[PDB]
Design a protein that fits this description.
part of a larger assembly, 3 chains, A alpha+beta (about 350), B alpha/beta (about 525), C alpha/beta (about 575), A: about 350 residues, alpha+beta, two-stranded parallel sheet, 12 strands, about 25% helix, B: about 525 residues, alpha/beta, Rossmann fold, 5-stranded mixed barrel, 3-stranded parallel β-sheet, 16 helices, about 35% helix, elongated, replication/dna, DNA replication, OCCM-deltaC6, REPLICATION-DNA complex
Chain lengths: ~350, ~525, ~575
């Protein structure tokens, strides 16, 4: 692993892109020079296409996708300076933008691994520092709060404002002056803090939970903590299923929320409705109508919104009244999130 | 060094029944890696007068010298035994038992401190098996220097202390937790026999330190004879160095067993001032052992113990006969309803005051393993103890389950209660509603024999059951609603086994069943009215 | 490492190299580990440990075996150094430690945790039991990598635990560095900093291997995904006291000879076996032959058929027993608890939680809420016994409503939703609310239970005790007057080896019996769909009591005879 050639590869990638105006990364730098956006999204698909273009011309690849996947915290501070080495002139500590990443999909993975849907039981311990894509429900979210990154101190005696960098949860106030003028002096005059020149970040903690059908037999769905920063702070509203891609210290970078041969061979056999009716729960006898309505029940229907402040249900509710559990268990085993059948929190003081 | 050779000559030269008793025992204990050996004080006083008096006067400085001589001969035994077929040897802890004297707890005085002391009692508690060290490597954090310290028998102002200096200043030492040996130890509590304790004051207790080889060898609640060192930490404590738990007695017991009016004098002896109540006295004296314990090959064994209940007005020795059954029977402890003052029949639970820890207080229920239990004031029972005694009176097992401790305690515990939804537990769970030579004969009969029953005397029981079921059915179909069960018949069988067991016989005849039906008829007359 | 190695390390490393040169079973195994890692790297893992069979170590070297058993702190180290040297010598491609594991008999070192005391500290301890808690997986700090930005370069300082060493080296702390040499700030990098995860689990004694003892196990990165509460486990570690065990080998889990198999093969073709085996279980109880015939068919089990791409099928049978309280219904539970493979008995009233299955608790350690498993979740294949069924409340009734049809259970509570599936055949014993019962009273209201619970339980056995002078004459002489270790081996060999299948000779007679009873609906007892399933479960039972590979017509005939006794 070398950095001197990989940084040259990083700075050569952003100026030689034509696969997806013109050089889109330089256009995004012109857009951030126009001061319209504050978020930078880097994909591995462009990296894979640039690697294919460099490998087909007989040049050395010097792989980025096997190096971005391990230690992305060094890469987000190393490629940021390579982006910082070249910017277009505007026409309309000094980080105007925010750098973020996103992994490659499985469709770009089969077409020449790094992004697999991981469980929290499938963490093993040794994945601390790999980019991981976790799937799960979100139960606990917190409010958006400003967390400082660098503390700015000002002096009236020298004028040289100093900046210290914090990394932990807590810190100590540097009352002693560490400037370049107070070292060669008898006087060591008082310093003050600035809440305006100090760089902050929209920090938010979240608790991702383990999926219901992905947990093993008998085990309970344990949780995990995700620490987000910046513009991703409002992309997490509780009561949903999410796929979070980030580094594991969890510092998230990209979030998202919710085969053709397999659907066309099920369609082409003929009488799709009756085949899908008699296919589910075949260990019982008959009752095609009841379980046919169960098929229409788990397919759900259409939720209708009038757009004037009124929402009606797009759901079915089925009763099974009978004389003297298998159908119910088969419906909950085939369908996802099937479950067989508010409070204040003092420590953090909130509505859990 | 001369004492080293003397103890080595005592080990390799003592003879009893034309054989050495310590050499083969050391070889057998080294071959199973027990690291212990049983020596008797009577053998060393019969061997040398230069050893026992010095051991009684100064045990703390002569005992580890004997211990290192034991390891010195053990090293030779190990290297000659390892070379025959198929390094590091710890200090071999010795245990030493004797029965030359049994001083009471009230005879402990300011004299003979730190000497050898042997006494009996009841272990109330042995909850903690804490850890100490025996060999520890220590290192410094400043000049990169390490060493090690060893201790062998000294396990609050004692020898064990870290060095203040090897500049590195005060206390620069770190214990190398990767290379040490752990010596388990226990803190135990012992009290005197409550059958012989003055009425004006509660029985006192004593604290003792238990080492490594005898750990978890004593269940709390039995007649335990402990021999050790009465040391001072002012407060006294006991360092345990040995643990254990007359033919004229058996001769006079065999002479008393040949008397035909023996049952009758026993009954004329259990009631010195009690007027009347012969049927209550015979049922009290026949409910000690229980019955015929039979281990069937199918695994479904039968219970042998029974239940007896006293009821009536205050007085009439309802709590005076219980003191005689507390001081007569082998294993029994006096308690009351819903526990007592700083003691409880039920498994109590409370706070270790050091940093408020949750832990358990054994009552009379776990400590009465293999005997009877005896309580007073049966109407005053808590709901958390009633379910436990409700299961233990018919299944002998007591189950407990809470935070970290889940267990089924065996409780061979018969009940001798006194009293004044309760109707079914009184009428259904109860079957009935010298002194040292007698206790010795009771223990020998409870361990030695396992009787049975003849069919010739069992046909009278069948005829009695058929007649009582044919006679009380007139009162039962007449809507009186009060009974008659096979459990009472099994109790009658256990009563006959106890009555035939008291003459130390494995067979039963009509002589015991004619007294058993007479004992049962008073209980049925009390149950009917 | 920094110190010079003596001959005490070199002799042990050459002895382990000679043992590995003698036995190539570990060398080809680590070569297979390396070629599997190379194939996965070529496509782009296994946790680098080889289990060592201890049986090859006793006959090869007695002193090495004794040194491993009495001093693993001085013997394990050089063996893992030999393993890392063998892993470097067996591989010739460019470019981490390697660990060890043991198995086999231990002798006196294999013991119960309640008998585990202060003796044999340094020696390795094999201890089995049941786990109570499994803590949260926590990553530790080792080798953080720092970036100094003004001069631009990396620094790295690593840390050491005081347990994961099984031996001795100098121990001291180190401040997590915040300032390099001189006056300048430096940043952290966690991209390459290792986070070895650890776990802390608790294990106590199984109730059968104890005259209660629970201990703590510190767990490394490798084996963090193989532990869960509720399962029987056997851990192998070192009893270190800084008291805990450094668990390196975990195995999640009567002996049979070749003489006992000849006896059970000799007793397999006689057609008088079933009646004498049903009569030989409890000789202290007079009568009730068909009830213990069903109890014999009950404790042996079923088949547990798992359907393809659908729900599983219930193989367990359930029995409810009612009658007058005079007989031995409370004396039969002790016999079935002491003679089964594994059994859990509860009183039916007095459970501290919400019932048997589970309970919620608060812990101030984590400052959170944990789950306690009271009963039915412990026994997953055995049997459970509940006496006094009418005193059991509706919450446990709703739970066993799920238990019966499920042969499982489900729970959804504040912060969790899940389903559990442990086999647990139930044996319920009840009493009427009137106290007594006779034939002239109706057989439905005397039961004091709902019709859904009558449909849940398969066999309902009514025991009458009206006073009759003819039958009651011999009970006194019978109670006044094949074996236990044989039927246990019989039941487990039938449970492990033979699975019975259906034939056409036993389908038609059970079809005829079910269609003839679907009579009872007009006369004395309701008929359900489930009962069809329970009418062949028992047949299979009898067919596996005779251990035949398939069923017979007589199995359905004895199931119909058991039905005629328990229904009429």
């Amino acid at each position: 692993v070398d950095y001197n050639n990989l940084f040259n590869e990083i700075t050569d990638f952003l100026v030689t892109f034509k696969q997806d105006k013109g050089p889109k990364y330089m256009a995004m730098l012109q857009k951030v020079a126009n001061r319209e956006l504050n978020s930078v999204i880097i994909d591995l698909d462009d990296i894979l296409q640039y690697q294919n273009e460099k490998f087909l011309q007989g040049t050395q690849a010097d792989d980025l996708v096997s190096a971005i996947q391990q230690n992305a915290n060094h890469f987000t501070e190393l490629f940021c300076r390579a982006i910082d080495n070249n910017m277009p002139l505007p026409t309309k500590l000094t980080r105007r933008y925010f750098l973020y990443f996103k992994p490659l999909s499985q469709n770009c993975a089969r077409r020449y691994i790094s992004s697999k849907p991981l469980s929290v039981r499938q963490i093993k311990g040794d994945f601390l520092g790999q980019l991981i894509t976790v799937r799960g429900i979100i139960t606990r979210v917190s409010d958006v709060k400003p967390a400082v990154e660098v503390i700015a101190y000002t002096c009236d005696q020298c004028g040289y404002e100093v900046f210290q960098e914090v990394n932990s949860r807590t810190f100590t106030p540097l009352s002693e002056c560490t400037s370049e003028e107070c070292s060669q002096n008898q006087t060591k005059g008082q310093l003050f803090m600035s809440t305006r020149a100090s760089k902050f970040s929209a920090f938010q903690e979240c608790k991702i939970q383990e999926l219901s059908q992905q947990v093993p037999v008998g085990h309970i769905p344990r949780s995990l903590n995700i620490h987000v920063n910046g513009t991703l702070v409002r992309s997490l509203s509780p009561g949903d299923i999410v796929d979070v891609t980030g580094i594991f210290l969890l510092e998230a970078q990209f979030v998202r929320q919710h085969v053709e041969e397999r659907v066309m061979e099920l369609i082409t056999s003929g009488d799709v409705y009756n085949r899908l009716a008699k296919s589910i729960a075949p260990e019982i006898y008959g009752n095609l109508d009841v379980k046919k309505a169960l098929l229409l029940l788990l397919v759900g229907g259409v939720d209708k919104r009038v757009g004037d402040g009124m929402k009606i249900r797009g759901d079915i509710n089925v009763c099974l009244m009978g004389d003297p559990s298998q159908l119910l268990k088969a419906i909950c085993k085939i369908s996802p999130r099937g479950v067989y059948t508010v409070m204040k929190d003092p420590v953090t003081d909130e509505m859990i | 060094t001369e004492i080293i050779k003397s103890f080595k000559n005592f080990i390799l030269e003592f003879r009893l029944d034309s054989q050495f008793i310590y050499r083969d025992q050391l070889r057998n204990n080294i071959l199973v890696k027990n690291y212990s050996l049983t020596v008797n004080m009577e053998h060393l006083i019969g061997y040398n007068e230069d050893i026992y008096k010095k051991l009684s006067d100064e045990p703390s400085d002569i005992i580890p010298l004997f211990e290192t001589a034991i390891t010195q001969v053990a090293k030779r035994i190990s290297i000659l035994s390892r070379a025959q077929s198929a390094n590091s040897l710890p200090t071999f802890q010795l245990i030493l038992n004797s029965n030359a004297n049994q001083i009471p707890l009230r005879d402990l005085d300011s004299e003979h401190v730190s000497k050898i002391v042997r006494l009996s009692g009841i272990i109330i508690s042995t909850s903690v098996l804490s850890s100490r060290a025996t060999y520890l490597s220590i290192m410094c954090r400043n000049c990169r220097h390490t060493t090690s310290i060893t201790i062998n028998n000294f396990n609050t102002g004692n020898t064990v202390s870290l060095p203040r200096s090897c500049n590195c200043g005060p206390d620069p030492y770190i214990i190398i937790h990767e290379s040490s040996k752990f010596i388990d130890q226990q803190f135990l509590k012992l009290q005197e026999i409550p059958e012989l304790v003055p009425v004006g004051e509660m029985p006192r207790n004593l604290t003792m330190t238990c080492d490594r080889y005898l750990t978890n060898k004593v269940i709390p609640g039995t007649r335990v004879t402990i021999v050790g060192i009465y040391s001072i930490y002012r407060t006294p404590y006991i360092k345990i160095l040995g643990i254990q738990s007359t033919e004229e007695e058996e001769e006079e017991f065999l002479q008393l067993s040949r008397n035909p009016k023996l049952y009758e004098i026993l009954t004329n002896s259990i009631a010195p001032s009690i007027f009347g109540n012969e049927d209550i006295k015979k049922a009290i004296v026949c409910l000690l052992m229980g019955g015929s314990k039979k281990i069937l090959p199918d695994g479904m064994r039968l219970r042998g113990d029974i239940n007896v209940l006293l009821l009536g007005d205050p007085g009439t020795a309802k709590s005076q006969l219980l003191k005689f059954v507390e001081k007569v029977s082998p294993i029994a402890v006096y308690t009351s309803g819903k526990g007592s003052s700083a003691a409880g029949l039920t498994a109590s639970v409370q706070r270790d005051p050091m940093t408020r820890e949750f832990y358990l207080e054994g009552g009379a229920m776990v400590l009465a393993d293999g005997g009877v239990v005896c309580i007073d004031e049966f109407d005053k029972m808590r709901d958390e103890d009633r379910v436990a005694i409700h299961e233990a009176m018919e299944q002998q097992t007591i189950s407990i389950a809470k935070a970290g401790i889940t267990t089924v305690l065996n409780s061979r515990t018969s009940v001798l209660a006194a009293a004044n939804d309760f109707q079914t537990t009184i009428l259904s769970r109860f079957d009935m509603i010298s002194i040292e030579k007698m206790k010795r004969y009771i223990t020998y009969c409870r361990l030695k024999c396992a009787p049975r029953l003849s069919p010739q005397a069992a046909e009278k029981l069948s005829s009695n059951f058929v007649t009582i079921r044919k006679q009380l059915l007139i009162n039962e179909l007449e809507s009186t609603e009060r009974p008659i069960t096979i459990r009472q018949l099994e109790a009658i069988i256990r009563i006959t086994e106890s009555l035939a067991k008291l003459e130390l016989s494995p067979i039963a005849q009509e002589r015991h069943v004619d007294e058993a039906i007479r004992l049962f008829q008073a209980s049925t007359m009390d149950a009917a009215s | 490492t920094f110190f010079a190695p003596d001959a005490v390390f070199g002799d042990r490393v050459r002895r382990f190299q000679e043992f590995l040169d003698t036995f190539t079973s570990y060398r080809d195994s680590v070569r297979s580990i390396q070629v599997y890692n190379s194939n996965n790297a070529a496509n782009y893992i296994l946790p680098h440990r080889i289990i060592i069979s201890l049986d090859d170590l006793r006959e090869f070297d007695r002193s090495f075996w004794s040194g491993i058993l009495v001093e693993p702190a001085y013997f394990i180290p050089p063996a893992e150094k030999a393993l890392t040297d063998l892993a470097d010598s067996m591989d010739d491609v460019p470019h981490h430690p390697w660990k060890l594991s043991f198995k086999g008999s231990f002798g006196a070192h294999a013991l119960s945790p309640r008998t585990l005391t202060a003796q044999h500290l340094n020696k390795l301890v094999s201890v089995e039991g049941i786990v109570t808690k499994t803590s949260l997986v926590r990553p530790k700090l080792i080798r953080s990598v720092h970036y100094a930005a003004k001069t631009g370069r990396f620094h790295y300082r690593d840390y050491t635990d005081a347990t994961t060493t099984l031996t001795t080296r100098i121990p001291t702390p180190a401040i997590y560095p915040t300032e390099d040499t001189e006056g300048n700030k430096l940043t952290t990098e966690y991209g390459y900093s290792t986070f070895i995860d650890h776990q802390r689990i608790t294990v106590q004694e199984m109730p059968e291997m104890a005259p209660p003892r629970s201990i703590d196990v510190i767990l490394d990165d490798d084996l963090v995904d193989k532990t869960k509460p509720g399962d029987r486990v056997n851990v192998v570690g070192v009893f270190k006291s800084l008291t805990l065990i450094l668990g390196n080998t975990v195995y999640p889990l009567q002996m049979l000879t070749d003489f006992d198999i000849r006896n059970i093969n000799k007793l397999s073709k006689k057609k008088d076996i079933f009646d004498i085996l049903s009569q030989s279980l409890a000789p202290s109880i007079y009568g009730h032959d068909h009830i213990k015939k069903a109890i014999l068919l009950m404790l042996m089990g079923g088949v547990e058929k798992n359907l393809e791409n659908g729900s599983h099928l219930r193989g367990d049978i359930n029995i409810l027993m009612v009658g007058d309280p005079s007989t031995a219904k409370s004396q039969l539970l002790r016999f079935v608890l002491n003679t089964a493979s594994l059994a859990i008995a509860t009183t039916g009233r007095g459970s501290s939680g919400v019932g048997l299955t589970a309970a919620v608790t608060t812990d101030r350690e984590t400052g959170e809420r944990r789950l306690e498993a009271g009963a039915m979740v412990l026994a997953d294949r055995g049997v459970v016994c509940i006496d006094e069924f009418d005193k059991m409340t509706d919450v446990d009734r709703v739970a066993i409503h799920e238990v019966m049809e499920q042969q499982t259970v489900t729970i959804a509570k504040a912060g969790i939703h899940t389903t559990l599936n442990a086999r647990c055949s139930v044996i319920a014993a009840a009493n009427p609310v009137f106290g007594q019962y006779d034939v002239n009273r109706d057989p439905h209201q005397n039961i004091a239970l709902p019709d859904s619970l009558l449909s849940r339980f398969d066999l309902l056995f009514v025991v009458t005790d009206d006073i009759n002078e003819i039958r009651d004459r011999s009970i006194s002489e019978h109670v006044l007057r094949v074996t236990i270790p044989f039927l246990r081996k019989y039941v487990q060999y039938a449970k492990e080896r033979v699975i019975p299948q259906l034939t056409q000779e036993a389908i038609n007679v059970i079809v005829k019996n079910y269609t003839d009873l679907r009579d009872d609906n007009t006369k004395k007892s309701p008929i359900t769909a489930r009962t069809l399933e329970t009418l062949i479960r028992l047949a299979t039972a009898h067919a596996k009591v005779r251990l035949s590979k398939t069923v017979n017509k007589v199995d359905a005939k004895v199931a119909a005879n058991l039905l005629r006794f328990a229904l009429l």
